[PDB]
Design a protein around this nucleic acid. Sequence first.
DNA 1: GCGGACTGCTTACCT
DNA 2: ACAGGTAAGCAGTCCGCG
Length: 757
Amino acid sequence: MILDTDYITENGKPVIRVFKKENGEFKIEYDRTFEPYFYALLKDDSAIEDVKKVTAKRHGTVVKVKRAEKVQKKFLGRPIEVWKLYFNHPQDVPAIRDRIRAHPAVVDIYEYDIPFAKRYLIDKGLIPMEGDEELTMLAFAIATLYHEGEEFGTGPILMISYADGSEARVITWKKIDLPYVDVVSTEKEMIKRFLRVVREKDPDVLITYNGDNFDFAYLKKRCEELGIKFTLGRDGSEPKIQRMGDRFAVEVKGRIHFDLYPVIRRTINLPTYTLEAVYEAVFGKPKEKVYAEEIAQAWESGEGLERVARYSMEDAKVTYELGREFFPMEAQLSRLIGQSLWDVSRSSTGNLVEWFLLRKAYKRNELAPNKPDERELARRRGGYAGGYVKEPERGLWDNIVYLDFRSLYPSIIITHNVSPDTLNREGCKEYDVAPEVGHKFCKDFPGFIPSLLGDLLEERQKIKRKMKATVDPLEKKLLDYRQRLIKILANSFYGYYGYAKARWYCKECAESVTAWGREYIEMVIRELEEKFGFKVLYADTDGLHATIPGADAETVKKKAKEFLKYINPKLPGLLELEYEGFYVRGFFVTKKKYAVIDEEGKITTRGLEIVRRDWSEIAKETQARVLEAILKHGDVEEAVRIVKEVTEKLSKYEVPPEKLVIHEQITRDLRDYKATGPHVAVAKRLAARGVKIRPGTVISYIVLKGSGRIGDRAIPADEFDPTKHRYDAEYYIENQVLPAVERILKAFGYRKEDLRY
DNA sequence: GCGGACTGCTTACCT
DNA sequence: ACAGGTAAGCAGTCCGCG
Ligand SMILES: [Ca+2]
Ligand SMILES: [Ca+2]
């Protein structure tokens, strides 16, 4: 099982290190043979010996092309002749590349910004996390003495928790008598002790929650102040911070630093992303939070260190338990994309697709398009037409069937062979022409992406067949992750086509997919209404809600499956319409906003205030109960009484503050905001007090009794006190509870004023 | 000028 | 930022009024 790669420099020459785990043992293979390179397209070969003479200085050393061999490749299908320029050191590439491009003979240069370690993985055809090799993991968390407006790392670490499958222990430097605590000399000894625990346990995976930003960064400042060599590396190195866009990443060589935060953020949609919130989402059990003021008060006083120690233990235990839950699916993602778990666990869906394509491009001798520069990125600023959203038939309706296409965008990309290499090819025989947009895609030969997408669809069939004929419950879960992850990768290619930073960006490809999508959903609706007896209530993009008005359940279901038997043969290649489900009643509010109740009585909610985090629990909960009254039961009168029960309780100040918290995200640097609002105003105040506000930070706030701009009386839910502060009953009634219900109860004929206490 | 209509910024959903 | 389509809060600005 390959874990990761990197390189070290020995006497000016690059040396690859492959971090393997084979036969229950960690190993480092060294490769001194592999050479860095990029490609150059020349106007004429006669110029090669002039471009070989081209030189550059890199930090006191003349960088020169080691050699050049001419190679034949494909660029977007068409064969191309380019010169593969080799260099002695991978760092030679950044120094030389700009000059070799500037040279008058050189039309362009290609594949010049591929990190050496990853160039090796691809070129050698190596896939990390292969085999059935069991890895040992250690989770760890830290507790600190934080004070308001304090610099980072000024406060000493109070406790270092760690947890695995066998134990969960705290390490601190105060006298705490509980079984799992370890009292040491000082802070210095506590840190040196943890290093010895890691050395002794030699774990293959370190697990943190947001360690990339807080935990590891904190320990490096502490170590430097204490003059400690922080040696977790199996090679004996210190953990290295690697910038990752607007955030950092900590790498520990020989081990896998598995930070759950980026994983949880990409996989689960929650109001907040606290350990306590995530643990409750994933496992269902609760976990209480200890606060910084309580922590410092418990240390300075020495009164209640035992509760602060339990929190530190439950942190590490929970982090390990989440570690074990998420690591397996992420290790499959690593195999599929063919990059380290570390890289893939922190990577956006753009980079995952791009890494996959780079690997497959190499296998198929396809030269990779360059990432766009400032002025080319500028040209891709334009948008394009998306999905077709039908204006819904508002109100309550009976006997509703949901029909939708299966993988419509992948179906279209494959069926119509949508790829940049097949776009407007000079002299084909057969063509598919996109409706409205009018781009022509060659049908003579398979396109790069279409072909890869065919491979994935069939690869997925094999896995689902292999899944049926296998008992081992663990092997079944690991193949279930592979097949689910293939599905996601496949559904990412359309979006990737329209992603301006993408190497294989193709607006024409993206446009044509959406256009065909609109043709098929609109054709299905037209057929369903004009020829069959259906009224289409709502249709978004690739799916529709239909009924036959003067008919019953049995009839609507039977006629729907009959329409599938009719239409699917008339639909080309992959394109196939499917019966998702029947619903006894359905309530369509607006575009993107509806609710349905099935045979069992389960209400499915889409788009309504119930699902959004930027609405208070009191409004979401109240709406949930108004909706249930009108779907589940037939009681429009019950719905009105619950509106009264909510509003009256709010004006008496009875509804508890937990149900008043509104969650909005900070999505840019606080200075980039052009318009202020409750969450931004709250976040700017926290910033002035020296609280860390990075993009992704969720602001949780409560509105206090007052008038005028909401932001002026918006404070963190943390700092809410019934002692001094008083919550705005009027606001939560007229701005939250009433708007949420009016949407549901507007249809029957109630105005806001008629639902208030 | 008042006060409601309107609209840009912004978020978070849907597919 | 993997895409565009969409509704709606907030806080400014707009604009109709007798
Ligand atoms: Ca549905
Ligand atoms: Ca078909």
